Amino acid sequence: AGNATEVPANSTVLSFCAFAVDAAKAYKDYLASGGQPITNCVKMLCTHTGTGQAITVTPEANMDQESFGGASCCLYCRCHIDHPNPKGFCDLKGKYVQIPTTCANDPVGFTLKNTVCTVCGMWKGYGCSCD
Amino acid sequence: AGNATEVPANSTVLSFCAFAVDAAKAYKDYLASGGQPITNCVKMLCTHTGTGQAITVTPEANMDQESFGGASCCLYCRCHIDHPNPKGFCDLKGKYVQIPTTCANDPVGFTLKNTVCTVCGMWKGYGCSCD
Amino acid sequence: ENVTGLFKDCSKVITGLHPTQAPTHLSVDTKFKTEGLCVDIPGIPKDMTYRRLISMMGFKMNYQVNGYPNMFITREEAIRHVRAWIGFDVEGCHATREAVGTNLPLQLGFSTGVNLVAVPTGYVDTPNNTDFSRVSAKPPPGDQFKHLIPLMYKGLPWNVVRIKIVQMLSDTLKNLSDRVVFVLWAHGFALTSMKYFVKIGPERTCCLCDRRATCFSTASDTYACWHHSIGFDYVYNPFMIDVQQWGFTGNLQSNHDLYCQVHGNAHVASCDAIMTRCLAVHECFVKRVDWTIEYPIIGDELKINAACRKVQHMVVKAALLADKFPVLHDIGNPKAIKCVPQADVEWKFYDAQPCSDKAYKIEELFYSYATHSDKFTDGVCLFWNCNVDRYPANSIVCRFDTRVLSNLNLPGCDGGSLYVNKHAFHTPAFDKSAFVNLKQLPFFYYSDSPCESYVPLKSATCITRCNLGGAVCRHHANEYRLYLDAYNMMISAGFSLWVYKQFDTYNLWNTF
Amino acid sequence: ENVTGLFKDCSKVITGLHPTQAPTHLSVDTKFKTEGLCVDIPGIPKDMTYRRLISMMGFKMNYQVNGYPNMFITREEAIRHVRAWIGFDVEGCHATREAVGTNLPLQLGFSTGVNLVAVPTGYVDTPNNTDFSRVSAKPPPGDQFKHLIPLMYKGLPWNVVRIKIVQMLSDTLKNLSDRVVFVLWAHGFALTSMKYFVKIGPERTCCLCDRRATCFSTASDTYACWHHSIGFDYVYNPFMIDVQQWGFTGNLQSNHDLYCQVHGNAHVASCDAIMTRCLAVHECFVKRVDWTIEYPIIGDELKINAACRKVQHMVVKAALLADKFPVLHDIGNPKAIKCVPQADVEWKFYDAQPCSDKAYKIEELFYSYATHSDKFTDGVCLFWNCNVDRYPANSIVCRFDTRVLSNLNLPGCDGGSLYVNKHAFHTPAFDKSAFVNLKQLPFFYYSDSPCESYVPLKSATCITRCNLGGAVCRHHANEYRLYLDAYNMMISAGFSLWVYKQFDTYNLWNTF
Amino acid sequence: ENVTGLFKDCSKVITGLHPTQAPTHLSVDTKFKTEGLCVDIPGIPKDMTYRRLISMMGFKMNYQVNGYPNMFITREEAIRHVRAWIGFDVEGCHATREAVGTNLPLQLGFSTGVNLVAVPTGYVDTPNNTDFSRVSAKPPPGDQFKHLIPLMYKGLPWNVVRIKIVQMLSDTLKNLSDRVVFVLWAHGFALTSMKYFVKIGPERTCCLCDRRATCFSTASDTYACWHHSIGFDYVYNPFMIDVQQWGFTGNLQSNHDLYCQVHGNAHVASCDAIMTRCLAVHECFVKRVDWTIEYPIIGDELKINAACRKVQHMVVKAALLADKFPVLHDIGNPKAIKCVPQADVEWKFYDAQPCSDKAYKIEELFYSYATHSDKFTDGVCLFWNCNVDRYPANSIVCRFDTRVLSNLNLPGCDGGSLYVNKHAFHTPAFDKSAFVNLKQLPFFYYSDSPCESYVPLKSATCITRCNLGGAVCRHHANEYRLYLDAYNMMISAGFSLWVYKQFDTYNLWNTF
RNA sequence: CCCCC
RNA sequence: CUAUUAAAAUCACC
RNA sequence: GGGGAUGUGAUUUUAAUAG
RNA sequence: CCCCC
RNA sequence: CUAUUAAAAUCACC
RNA sequence: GGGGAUGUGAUUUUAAUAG
Ligand SMILES: [Mg+2]
Ligand SMILES: [Mg+2]
Ligand SMILES: [Mg+2]
Ligand SMILES: [Mg+2]
Ligand SMILES: [Mg+2]
Ligand SMILES: [Zn+2]
Ligand SMILES: [Zn+2]
Ligand SMILES: [Zn+2]
Ligand SMILES: [Zn+2]
Ligand SMILES: [Zn+2]
Ligand SMILES: [Zn+2]
Ligand SMILES: [Zn+2]
Ligand SMILES: [Zn+2]
Ligand SMILES: [Zn+2]
Ligand SMILES: [Zn+2]
Ligand SMILES: [Zn+2]
Ligand SMILES: [Zn+2]
Ligand SMILES: [Zn+2]
């Protein structure tokens, strides 16, 4: 009964962050303690041309970036816990997220540490030039 | 596995006549000792018009007769034992047999007791007039 | 859901038979069925070449016919007809290639010990008749059936197999009984297998003699008893009892191993047959001795149980007048009838259960050497045909050697034996560690009577006042020869005579 | 046509029986039935090897016969006969192989923790008689009956089982009562199980004796009371009461869980019997004590009732002389009776509501340390056999310890106990937490009475003027020994004595 | 990279271990492995609560160390050490819940019928040590292992199990040998089971004694022989031999069934051990006796070998004087040695083929009553310890009864027995049917020798001139007592004496 | 589920 | 309106 | 591969059948 | 098959 | 030609 | 409804991969 969604490589990381008080710090400590990143994300088959905006309604990707389904890159959506956002609404759920390729090994961590510039809509420090 | 052919009302009569040395006398004694006749015969849906020959290749029935599948009215075929016929060939297997309606309660017994006139091909004593 | 596995068509053809050539109403396909009846359709012709295997499984021998004896008998009749119990177990192979859905007898085992492997052979439907033919078969899947794989290439045709069945049963039972009682564990597949070598009918008499006819030949349609059956291929009127119908749980080995340790090797046909017969013998005879059931005399039983009394009288009388014990204790005597009446000794009968004799001088004793070691210290303890764990030093015992298998001593449960003389007693296994305090009684003959009137008796064993002279009288000579024959007949039937180590023939020569 | 489930033919044979050898008209085969009557057809033989299991479910013991006592009694007689209550529950197995449609007693459990496993045994109609024999049976399907699966391989023959039933009932009830009252939850299967070990008949008297006969022997047709029943195998006149007929809906466990948390482990026979007896005890006695019903005297019930007055007179006298209490508060005193007649203290009575003394000397009071803590702070509070949640510090308490089981203290509901001395009091579960403000009362003998002048007593707890000298007088020595025996009898009965923490025997030694 | 199944990590954890606390390089987790070496990553912690089951399957005891004896011995040494053979079979369970990949000894069985059930116990690597602890296990799937299912709920802790192992081995072997030789069928699992109750080491000597040390205690590090091992829990130096390495294909049962029909009940541990030891005994001894290998003397082996010559001298002398036989036929005489040196009879020797006497006085003969019945009709036929199918009527037979088990008669193959006195003879199963033409030989003492002159012998079997008078002389009385003790020793050894039916002691009394 | 193979 | 099967549901027992 | 089955009653209803 | 519900 | 996985078959043990 | 699984080795072959 019911259709499985998860892989056995993701059990330890997803159990440990489901019982955690602060799941962001828990995931960062799990990574800093030699753990393996979260597998089984949805990688879009885009052609790597388009604007490099971070979070969009449709895949918009550069050649140095990749586009994932945003819900699949939110730790609070992967773990099914309360979002720390006001009104408890995921900003990546229902959108596409742009992860730089050098960080594309671990997208769930990337969206935990980086933030977007509100006037540009692209990742601070990686693509944002409005300094 | 396999498709069932027999009914539970026919077990006792068919077991007892399968182990019997003389199955004809065994069936007659089973009938004379209060047993129930052999059920589950193939009754042809004919229109009761035609010549009244006893054993035919096709249903040929009068209004006072009925036509059954001959294999279903041979005790040795119902019990899967050796026929007492020379060369061990059933004469009713592959044919249609004409049972008078007053005996149609028990056809398997009828073909045990009655015989046909070889020059007419109809049941002696019931329909044969060549005296 | 009213159908049977009996005569179930197991072939792999998807459609049924023609209106004709079909045994039953369910054996014709739906293409011809019409308002619960059949209709000849001119297009479809009847199949003229086909082979359909028929499942001879699910027989029910519950017929009541006036002149025909019933195959399945009650427990009381089976108990009365011991010396006809032949255990029976069949191992079976499954039909795999041309038909699926029936089993076939591959190995037939009997409590005699024989195993008969048969070619897998079934009853196939032909358009003209039913043919008894070899079919394709495979051994059962599983690791407890891996010993049946070499048997699929061995095995005789069923003609030789049923002739050997009749030969084995007639060699076993010709001196034991006038019938055969197959002791089955689960009668379904056993009845399936019995279809091959059993043919029943009204009770007939042997040709060539007057005993009950038990075998029947199909070459010449004649019946014979167990003696005159040579070349006969069918067992005419076997009786049988199922033992699972006696309220058991689990398989045969789990129920046999509760009471017996000397049988084993489950799922071999002969060993399963021996287990079945042993379990039935336990369930009917190990409990206690029933004196209401008396068995016929197959041979030399009266001579044996008269020689027992003769030897008992002579031995006890001679031992008493040899050493003059104060008191003897007759342990195990149900009825207070003493062995030697003319004895100047105080007699005390003992039995754990008094056999309803109102003269209650029989004391109550369930003997065991561990607890009753000093129950009787001096005197002698007559242990005639009683079974205890160990006999004390001052004893005189007649034990039955259960390892001597005869027409009167049938194999029993847990190493014991069912000695059937007039009443069937079940004796526990003979253990020679009980006689460590005794020695074997030697042959001797003693007589007090006066005497007078082919060779004269030259023997140092004849203890008589007639023997002191150079010759012996013709009276004690023939009486000695009769007692010698009686003693030989008693010990050859399996009776061991043990006595205390102080016994000797000199104190019998005291009197002369 | 209306039928009943009693004596139902459970066999798997499709046909009926012959006109002869059929017990009723509904058992005859339909070949013979003609116009409401039967016809002897001469050709049909009669079956002689049949075995038909008979359902023993559906007994109705509602007979009215003159000399025969009724098995099912009303709840008033059951209340009057509490020392005989033995709970009873039976688990069953279902006959599976040759007969379907009946259940068989597999495991019998009683209020005493005694579980007896029997072999599955039924009543099988044979053509000569009804055979009480072992039949094929399987445990009930499901998971709450999966503990019954190992019990099919275990089990005892029913003769041994009923011998042990009678032995255990006799050891339990020989000193309590002259009868047994089986406390059944649902009597449908318990009446079926009673067919195996219970007889009935007119009221008889024990042989060797004059007590009511409760056991019956089948070896010799003799009757016996609970004392002389050795080797007796049948319960002769058991009484019983069904608790589900007291207005109960739901399971037994669902109704026992409302009032008790001590028992559990449902569907084990002895545990269900304990649950049934506990539920009956709760329904009958937990509500309110009845002084109308009295009970006979087992033994030591007049010595205990005198010892608990010899003690109540002493400790309430000594506690008032040693402390000079100005006021007393007697909580729970049903009658306007003083423990000591003369006392300088002023007395005050309390109880729940005036117990048959409508004079206004006794006040109504419901005491509880949560609400009534600081109202009686002055003086002492004499709690004699009044069970409250916590006693105050200024108390002289006698409290029955319900953890001491005896001939007089039967097990009760929710950890309490039914102490039945003359009248039945149900006392709640003992807890030491109610005595945190008190200490135990030390044993002492106080005597101020005049004196007269022979083993010398050299104990120092004897507070009297004769002990101030070297030797105690013969009058106070034997009186001390009487009081010591009474005190030991009282504290062995299960009564615990408590006193305020400042109690000491020094002030008793001072007034002299 | 080649690996082995020994010490295999059976746990279900997907990762490996830290560089520390990993026993080998193949156990380190792949995070740390770099260039064939490991790297200490400081951020990664070490697991401190892990429990990893370790597979004890795959031991290879092929070491060559100077002071340490080898466990696995060649078949020549095993043949030389037959009195120590104890068969050994172990059934196992499979670890199921937290670790998969190993089997655990559940039931240990020996040639003696001793089955020992143990709790499933393994070696679990913990971060501090290896814990010998109980682990989750399930019985093997299938039907031939369904009898092991009730054994998981039974079982003993392994300390009790090895205490009982040492106790049973000591009670079995203390009088036979100074070592134990485990006869294994397939040593793969028996070596795993031996890790639990077997130590090894250099050869030690028993404390309190001077015999080889076979047991070792862990409470105090002391060693003991089979006599002084009380409370010892380890077998110190067991030897063993694998029978499957003797060129065998197929099951153990498939190979035991070829030569023996007595044992059975496969996959029960003690039954499989009995089968293994029986198969080894058949392969080593049933073929042909070897006079090259001798055996040490347990006890009473020189008294028996002298008694069976004291008796063979007497009965063959008395049987030739009492009958005056013209010719003798010695069947089975390996050497040209006469039982009596001087005799008027003419002697003839026979054996199978000339046994180390190449002189032509001994003929070669294979005897069998079916073929060699009527060739030696004249004279007597002395069968001294020659086992044929049936002896002729004119015979003096001494036959070893293989049903008597003793320190000298070990169990053998196919109901026979291995009688090991000085040399090992395997004798076939005893049957009384070979003595139908003979009777037992009565005890008698014959003496014709000169005489000299103190308890008087009053037995009448003493055939000598001193017994013709009133009192027997002191010379023949003590000689009679010596011969009686020798005869009783011989018949307690298990030897049965038979003689022709016309034998009588009368003619012995006549020559005087 | 139980029994048989 | 009464009785008889069949089915379903609920309840208690196993 | 072969079977044998799947326990005891009570009370409401629903359709019917018979009266 | 075993455990949990 | 050597080694390493994967699969299949057979065999022995449980 | 939820899982967890389905033991130990040995020898031949078959494809491959690497050398
Ligand atoms: Mg079998
Ligand atoms: Mg109940
Ligand atoms: Mg219950
Ligand atoms: Mg083995
Ligand atoms: Mg084994
Ligand atoms: Zn989210
Ligand atoms: Zn910006
Ligand atoms: Zn036919
Ligand atoms: Zn005609
Ligand atoms: Zn004859
Ligand atoms: Zn047996
Ligand atoms: Zn005489
Ligand atoms: Zn009494
Ligand atoms: Zn309770
Ligand atoms: Zn005084
Ligand atoms: Zn020692
Ligand atoms: Zn053997
Ligand atoms: Zn002498």
Author numbering:
A (entry chain C), B (entry chain G): 1 to 131
C (entry chain H), D (entry chain F), E (entry chain B): 2 to 454, 465 to 523
What text comes from the article?
Nsp14 is a bifunctional enzyme that harbors both 3′-to-5′ ExoN and mRNA cap guanine-N7 methyltransferase (N7-MTase) activities. The N-terminal ExoN domain of nsp14 improves RNA synthesis fidelity by removing misincorporated nucleotides or nucleotide analogs from the nascent RNA, whereas the C-terminal N7-MTase domain is involved in the 5′ capping processes of the viral genomic and subgenomic mRNAs. The ExoN activity of nsp14 is stimulated by nsp10, which binds to the ExoN domain and helps stabilize the architecture of the ExoN active site. However, the efficacy of nucleotide analog inhibitors on coronavirus RdRp is compromised by the presence of the viral nsp14 exoribonuclease (ExoN), an RNA proofreader that is specific to coronaviruses and a few other closely related virus families of the Nidovirales order and crucial to maintain the integrity of their unusually large RNA genome.
(E) Cryo-EM map and atomic model of the tetrameric form of the SARS-CoV-2 nsp10-nsp14-RNA complex. (C) Active-site structure of the SARS-CoV-2 nsp10-nsp14 (E191A)–RNA complex. Mg2+ ions, green spheres. +1CP, –1CP, and two active-site metal ions are superimposed with their cryo-EM densities contoured at 7σ. The shallow SARS-CoV-2 ExoN substrate binding pocket encompasses only base pairs –1 and –2 of the dsRNA, interacting with the RNA backbone through the A1 of nsp10 and K9, W186, and Q245 in nsp14. At the 3′ end of the dsRNA substrate, nsp14 separates the mismatched C-U pair and flips +1UT out of the RNA double helix. As a result, binding in the SARS-CoV-2 ExoN active site is a dsRNA with a 1-nt 3′ overhang comprising +1CP, a substrate structure different from that observed in other RNA virus and proofreading DED/EDh exonucleases and from that previously predicted for SARS-CoV ExoN. F146 at the bottom of the SARS-CoV-2 ExoN substrate binding pocket stacks against the 3′-end unpaired +1CP.
